[model samples]
Target: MQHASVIAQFVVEEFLPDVAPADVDVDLDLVDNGVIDSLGLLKVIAWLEDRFGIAADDVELSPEHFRSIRSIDAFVVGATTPPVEAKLQ
Candidate 1:
């Protein structure tokens, strides 16, 4: 959980440098806030892929999944973990 927060902070500080910390409301839209666009989304996906060792396909990319910091944290947690079947079955 703390790691996710650190990663989120890095995402905001390093990736979206122009966005003020105060403006980073948990419900803000990365795209709508002009913090990220299509290309930016690709960069973010690449960052997550390299940082968390998870691949994100086009179909997996969606605004709903990347809408807010909290949502992104959940996405990263789910993405980085092994499948439930892999663990139980």
Candidate 2:
């Protein structure tokens, strides 16, 4: 599974305690649904930075990048993928 998959699953487990991970819709609006607030957002940022070895400064850090599981997944893949950095040296 991808890092985003793990992250998405954990989000359901952590933020949506009332719901099962299997039930979480990948593209659900977590922010609009009260799943990810300011605090929760921080927790997720920290998780991605640590878990994916991504430098926080390397990402855009815009709310749009974290509005949903699908977005976060895509953002993480783009952030960690090689060739994005270390260009012709």
Candidate 3:
């Protein structure tokens, strides 16, 4: 499954159980919509680190990285994938 799919599923299940996973837009501002509070954000970060094996120090724990599904997905992609310059060599 795509990163967004997994992220959406987790978000809906954990934070917004009443909302359908498909209903959570990738660009939706989770914080602004009251979908997740500060503690909830920590849960997401913990899950991401556990599920993806991302080291704690490897990523910035900024709110921007977890603002929306798209941003989270992007953060995961950036964390897991090597840079393009290295791949091109």
Candidate 4:
């Protein structure tokens, strides 16, 4: 999706500032590459949540869900639907 590309670009520009966009493969590990730490990951989650109007539960915030640009894109799209509780409680 276009939003995924925009989000990927944001990650490259904001989180991986030291790295060139060309150097970042879609599947490269953002954490393993030292581009993003735990706090940085949380910030990324927050950015996605705020931008897309979704809330992330702890269970959904895993390294597996945020390992790379592609993974992050999937996670954001999958989680874009508001939590059921938002309507129920």
Model 1 regions more than 4 Å off: 14-27, 34-37, 50-55, 81-89
lDDT of 2 at 74: 66
Each candidate: what lDDT? 0.54, 0.57, 0.57, 0.56
In model 2, which runs have C-alpha deviations exceeding 4 angstroms? 1-4, 33-37, 51-54, 81-89
- Once fitted onto the true fold, the runs of candidate 3 whose alpha carbons sit more than 4 angstroms away are 33-37, 51-53, 81-89
**C-alpha RMSD values across all candidates:** 8.7, 8.5, 8.8, 8.1
What is the TM-score ranking, best to worst?
2, 3, 4, 1
TM-score of every model? 0.53, 0.59, 0.58, 0.55
Worst 10 residues of 3 by lDDT: 80-89
Model 4 Cα RMSD, 1 decimal:
8.1
Q: What's model 4's overall lDDT?
A: 0.56
For candidate 1, lDDT tens digit of each residue in 1-89? 63644544544554556665446554555556444546666775675466656657633766666566676667656656322211112
Could you tell which candidate, 1 or 2, scores higher by TM-score? 2
Candidate 3 TM-score versus the reference: 0.58
The stretch of ten residues in a row with the least summed lDDT in candidate 4 is 80-89
